């Protein structure tokens, strides 16, 4: 298949190619050609860490491929993965030279933990790309922030503030059907994570935990659980008390 090219005709975006243009179409400079990365976010996909990770999977025998893109979209949700095997060996390769994190992320979901990782590289199960800094890869690199997305190619017609917040999670059984996630409050206080939980709810609950003083006050690990009664939540652009009952389990009602 020939790689499609976007062209504006009759006040609408058309898919075409350079072999299918008419003499009136004018290309006077390579500046008129542009590559754009668009975020899966903008098509309405679930962005919570549980939903997002199930779109990725390990596979051997397929060499990684990288394609550049010149312009991108600000992301609400990005991901940054540090996954090892139970024996402690790395599941993802170090970022190759010159590959940097995606440059505009409102929330960086940083996931550390373990899984079997039954394959040499982690690919997108839907054929999408992992978008880094103006480089789109078929595979995930270790510890390197990315947005899920896809790339478009265009013929142009010739003519505030950046904040970012890292949300940390721990995971077991990563990349399987029995994966479990914990939202990290400090190194000893965690909240059991649900797909329902938005970033701002997580940041809210984190803040209430610190201020109300419900962090672990022990050597041991304190895991909070949020029972279904309370509401947490629509796409991003269009929009209590705690008791211990024991590791140390508890409940936020």
């Amino acid at each position: 298949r020939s790689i499609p090219l976007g062209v504006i005709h009759n006040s609408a975006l058309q898919v075409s190619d350079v072999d299918k243009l008419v003499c009136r179409d004018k290309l006077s400079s390579t500046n008129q050609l542009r590559s754009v990365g668009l975020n899966l976010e903008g098509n309405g996909v679930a962005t919570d860490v549980p939903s997002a990770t199930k779109r990725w999977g390990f596979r051997s025998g397929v060499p990684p491929k990288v394609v550049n893109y010149e312009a991108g979209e600000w992301a609400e949700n990005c991901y940054n993965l540090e996954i090892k095997k139970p024996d402690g060996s790395e599941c993802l390769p170090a970022a190759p030279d010159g590959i940097r994190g995606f440059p505009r992320c409102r929330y960086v979901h940083k996931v550390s933990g373990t899984g079997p990782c039954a394959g040499d590289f982690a690919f997108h199960k839907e054929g999408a790309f992992f978008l880094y800094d103006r480089l789109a890869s078929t595979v995930i690199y270790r510890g390197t922030t990315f947005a899920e997305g896809v790339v478009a190619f265009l013929i142009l017609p010739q003519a505030s503030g950046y904040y970012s917040t890292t949300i940390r999670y721990q995971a077991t059984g990563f990349g399987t059907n029995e994966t479990e996630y914990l939202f990290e409050v400090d190194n000893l206080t965690y909240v059991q994570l649900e797909s329902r939980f938005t970033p701002q709810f997580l940041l809210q609950l984190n803040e209430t935990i610190y201020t109300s003083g419900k962090r672990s006050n022990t050597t041991g690990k304190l895991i909070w659980k949020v029972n279904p009664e309370i509401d947490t939540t629509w796409a991003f652009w269009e929009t209590l008390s705690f008791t211990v009952v024991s590791x140390x389990x508890x409940x936020x009602x």
């Binding site: 975006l13 898919v15 350079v18 003499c23 976010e41 098509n43 979209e73 600000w74 940097r100 790309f129």
Partner: protein, 128 residues
């Protein structure tokens, strides 16, 4: 073909980042200029003519051909797609003999008909 967005949703606004231009003072010197995080400009485009929602569908539909291209190349990192499109554009229009007034031939003799239609009034204009 015209592009039909068939996604669950569409964010109709494109808050984009890209790289730039006319520098200020010494800011073009790598030693003095911005770090990797600070080379980006930002803009906002709205969905006039449905171009943003169309663009999202276009990127989505491009993926199959792009992936098949990446599968078949041995370059680890591909930077040449747009340059090759530019070459193929030129080869389409100028890769063979251009037969004037043919449909695959982009030369207009509109004025140069007029320049010799004015030259019908050259000799048998003044055919005294």
């Amino acid at each position: 073909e015209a592009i039909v967005n068939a996604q669950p949703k569409c964010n109709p606004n494109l808050h984009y980042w890209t790289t730039q231009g006319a520098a200020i003072g010494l800011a073009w010197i790598p030693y003095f200029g911005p770090a990797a995080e600070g080379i980006y400009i930002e803009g906002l485009m709205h969905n006039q003519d449905g171009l943003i929602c169309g663009l999202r569908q276009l990127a989505n539909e491009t993926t199959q051909a792009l992936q098949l291209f990446l599968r078949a190349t041995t370059e680890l990192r591909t930077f040449s797609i747009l340059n090759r499109k530019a070459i193929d554009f030129l080869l389409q229009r100028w890769g063979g003999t251009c037969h004037i007034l043919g449909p695959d031939c982009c030369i207009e003799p509109a004025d140069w008909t007029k320049n010799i239609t004015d030259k019908i009034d050259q000799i048998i204009h003044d055919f005294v």
